[PDB]
Amino acid sequence: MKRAVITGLGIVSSIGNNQQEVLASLREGRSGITFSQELKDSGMRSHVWGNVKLDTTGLIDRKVVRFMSDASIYAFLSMEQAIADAGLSPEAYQNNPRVGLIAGSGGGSPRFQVFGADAMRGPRGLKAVGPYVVTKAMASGVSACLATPFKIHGVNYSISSACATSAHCIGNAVEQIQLGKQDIVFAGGGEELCWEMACEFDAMGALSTKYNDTPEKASRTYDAHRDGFVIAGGGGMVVVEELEHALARGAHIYAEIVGYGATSDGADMVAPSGEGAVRCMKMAMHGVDTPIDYLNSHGTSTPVGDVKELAAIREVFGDKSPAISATKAMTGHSLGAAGVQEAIYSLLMLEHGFIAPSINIEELDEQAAGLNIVTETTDRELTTVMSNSFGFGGTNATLVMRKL
Amino acid sequence: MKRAVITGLGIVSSIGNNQQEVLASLREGRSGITFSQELKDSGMRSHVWGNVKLDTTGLIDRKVVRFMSDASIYAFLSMEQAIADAGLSPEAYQNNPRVGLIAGSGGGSPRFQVFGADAMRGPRGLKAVGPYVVTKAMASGVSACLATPFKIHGVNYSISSACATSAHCIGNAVEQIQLGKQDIVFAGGGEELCWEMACEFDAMGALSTKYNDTPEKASRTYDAHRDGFVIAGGGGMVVVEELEHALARGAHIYAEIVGYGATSDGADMVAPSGEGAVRCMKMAMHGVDTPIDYLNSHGTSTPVGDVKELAAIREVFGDKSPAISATKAMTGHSLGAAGVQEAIYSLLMLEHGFIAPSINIEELDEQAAGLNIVTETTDRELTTVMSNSFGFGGTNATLVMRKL
Amino acid sequence: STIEERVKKIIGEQLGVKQEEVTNNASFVEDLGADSLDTVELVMALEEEFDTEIPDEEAEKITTVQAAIDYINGHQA
Amino acid sequence: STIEERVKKIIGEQLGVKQEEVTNNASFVEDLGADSLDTVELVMALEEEFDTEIPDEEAEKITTVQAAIDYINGHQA
């Protein structure tokens, strides 16, 4: 089975519009959360979000962007960054059956699904809907809207698994390299940010509502007074590449993907069981002969979710004390984009030798006692890092990344 | 590596609510298309659809179905059928890390997304939305809503790739068996049927509009007077199983999956290039040392799509084309459910020794000259069959299935 | 069909239990198998039946059948 | 702005071409790269910009910049 490495990355997130800005935010413990007039005006109780702070006007050519929802826009910009960061030019990656793309979103486009129905019900009917709603709203919009303009000839599809979406995309890309079917797979995802999608999470009671006056304090994973997650949007993309192919072209290699876990709880629809996460982490660690130095936890800042993951980590590691932090306390939860963005934060920590802080822990939850939860930026030579993602439906993904 | 076989089938489609009903429809050339007052009342130009002829109200346990959109409901009923057909007791497949589920939809739930936004904007606001919209509308609803009640512990995610969705789900299930990671993977998909989704295809000019007075004559793949596809809904599921595991428990085996192609056009967003389909079919035939006896074409009944696929078939097979038929002339196009339903129709033809007719061809398209398009039910001993699926964004999937 | 009878109708059918299990001190969660999402939907069903809004601070207190009848009675019909 | 200027602005924005390739005898499909979805939206965009309703039979004949200018010029009042 071939070895898979990451040779490029790109990111558009609430804490930065490229990897340099994101790195600076992670080192400073900077929050990307702001007050949202749009969420408040819609009638929601949660008035905070992790928004992308970027004017995208004119960044994508008309013939390409006409098909795109915001998830695809964020993923496209992330892929442009990742292509450049990998040192790839069109002769190498375009029109190439050995080069593929696996990238998804959690929910397609709620905004454009609602637009289509609103337009259809207005006075102009079909003539108001226009011809571009399907590619904006379909679940595979992110892969379709990127594979076509980047002239991808290899694999082309989306994986969707709620908040594990883009972690499974990366793992599936790794499997394509392992099977020898592709030399390069671009993997990642995107997610739009809008009241159309956010209001259904508020209706479940899943979003933070008690910190609207202090938006940077609302996302507070492992804090005793956490009250739900803060919704976010953005995109990310990594270049997954076969090792000998990368070495032969003198690529820059961030890390090898040495473990990929994917499991299922088979239990509760909206709360993790813990048991599936234990198996997922153990699967991703199988055969890895170095300790996990740092774990980026899923850590959403919900009452129910945070304690279940802490218990799973304690069961997996027991004595050993991997450093742990939840970057969502800074970034919010970007849903289908979370897996790839958190893989990227972990790769930046590995590449630049530091642990990002778990912020806003004013009173540590009693269930977190004994764990090495890092609350201040800490320089450290890391070798092996792990990132967890979990989604509704009891779906779990874990990635383990290691220096070469 | 390991070999993968199909050991159970389940289906809910416009031409039948289980495999026996479907078999009878296929042999008879029976249309599943009906006039739709819903589509007409919405303001659409296309008034015909391939509806599931079953009231699903109250069929599924309230605590399970509260989470589900129609795509999940159709896939769930299909999965119950497939489990029974494969002879799997709960002890055999539940709470088992070696048993997984990969199943998707093309668009989640346009109906429930629009419901959520309509509720939020109405007089009760957030109190009208309720807590179940996310699991109904998220792209992974089909996998999430099934893996949880069926107690699945292995892989759990959705693949989405527009109208190739459930074909890629089957192919990825095969890959999990080949990698040695799973012994059984349930693979398939579902799609709801509603004006909220259909109107955006009418707005593209993709749906049939000239045959509303004769609904059974609207879907007419390869006919010179075709005028777009007929939208449909439903579900399907297959049990993908490692060969030695199936043999050791005495399972009934329909066929081995001996080929799986997945490619990308890198060209046009909504029209197939033909070139990507040629590579996809060649990839699926790699290492297959028997000829293709029957090809279930994607065959949507669009002007542009049908000619591109005919040209691709002619390029792959030349003067030795297999027998070809397009079951969508009977069934309509069930979008994310199409790939698994067409794999099931192909498996029934293989198992029962017949070729289903390509109906409604009153004048064969000029571009089909020299191809063996079957227009009457034909008894024939088949050994190797192929099924093609293509989707928006230039995504292609092909499956090749062969008797043991 | 008093306020008490109506509240028990909504509860029994929302939680899928026989109309004899809905005793006045029956807990939605402890006795009737409700989870956190069930309780959200149950409050909505009571709002629809009685055509009243229930504030979030008061809805969180409605975890038993008696708490539902107490609120509905205390707030007109 | 004149009708000609406004038509050329709409065509340029819709098809991703500078108001420079949008010459009067340019064909949307043969010269300006329009595909079958572009032709749908271009009609919508002209209808919106000039507050007119273009029947399908007339829209099918509007295949060049000049044909769009001619149509709008001839359907003001």
* CATH, residue A328: 3.40.47.10
Which residues 37-56 of D are in CB contact (within 8 Å) with B?
A: 37, 40
- A62 in contact with D at a CB cutoff of 8 Å? yes
d(CA B254, CA B350): 8
d(CA B57, CA B59): 6
Tokens of B2: 């390991």
Q: Is residue A398 part of a domain?
A: yes
d(CA C76, CA A256): 66
d(CA B118, CA B122): 6
Alpha helical stretches, state H, B271-352: 275-285, 303-317, 328-331, 338-352
Same domain, A252 and A273: no
**Cβ–Cβ under 8 Å, residues A188 and A239:** no
Torsion of CA B64, B66, B70, B71, to 10 degrees: -50
d(CA A195, CA A353): 38
Does D40 contact B204 at a Cβ distance shorter than 8 Å? yes
Same domain, B72 and B90: yes
Q: What is the CA radius of gyration of chain B?
A: 20
- D77 in contact with A at a CB cutoff of 8 Å? no
Residues listed for chain A: 404
d(CA B274, CA C5): 66
Same domain, B242 and B272: no
- Boundary of a domain, candidates A232, A259, A286: A259
Cα–Cα distance list, A177 to A9, A99, A263 (Å): 17, 10, 21
The structural domain count of chain A equals 2
Cα–Cα distance list, B247 to B186, B239, B244 (Å): 18, 14, 5
Do at least 3 CB pairs under 8 Å connect B with D? yes
Do at least 3 CB pairs under 8 Å connect C with D? no
- Boundary of a domain, candidates B259, B288, B317: B259
Helices B165-178 and B338-352, packing angle to 10 deg: 70
Instruction: List b or e across D24-62, with b for residues whose CB sees 16 or more CB atoms inside 10 angstroms.
Output: eebebeebbebbebbbbbbbbbbeeebeeebeeeebeeb
Q: Is residue A1 part of a domain?
A: no
Same domain, B48 and B172: yes
**Cβ–Cβ under 8 Å, residues B105 and A140:** no
Q: Is residue B210 part of a domain?
A: yes
- The 10 Å Cβ neighbour count of residue A382 is 22
Q: Is residue A13 part of a domain?
A: yes
**E-only strand ranges, A45-98:** 48-50
As annotated, the active-site residues of B are 163, 298, 333
Report the structure determination method: X-ray
In this structure, is the dihedral angle defined by the CA atoms of residues A222, A225, A228 and A234, taken in order, positive or negative?
A: negative
Q: What backbone torsions phi and psi does residue B390 show, to the nearest 5 degrees? A: -130, 155
d(CA A297, CA A333): 12
Distance from CA of D38 to the nearest CA of B (A): 10
d(CA B210, CA B60): 38
Distance from CA of B204 to the nearest CA of D (A): 7
Cα–Cα distance list, A140 to A99, B90, B162, B278, D35 (Å): 18, 33, 6, 22, 22
**Cβ–Cβ under 8 Å, residues B170 and B238:** yes
**Cβ–Cβ under 8 Å, residues A311 and A305:** no
Resolution (A): 1.5
Same domain, A293 and A170: no
Domain of residue A107 covers 6-259
Same domain, A152 and A252: yes
Q: What is the CA radius of gyration of chain D?
A: 11
Same domain, B39 and B160: yes
Same domain, A233 and A268: no
* Beta bridge pairs of residue B160: A158
Same domain, A250 and A266: no
d(CA A350, CA A403): 8
Same domain, B327 and B197: no
d(CA A385, CA A295): 6
DSSP-assigned letter for residue B322: P
Place of tokens 């227009």: B375
Does D37 contact B270 at a Cβ distance shorter than 8 Å? yes
d(CA B19, CA B74): 14
Q: Is residue B156 part of a domain?
A: yes
- Boundary of a domain, candidates B240, B259, B278: B259
Distance from CA of B157 to the nearest CA of C (A): 23
Same domain, A265 and A227: no
**Cβ–Cβ under 8 Å, residues A264 and A396:** yes
Does C37 contact B62 at a Cβ distance shorter than 8 Å? no
Q: Is residue B1 part of a domain?
A: no
Same domain, A190 and A202: yes
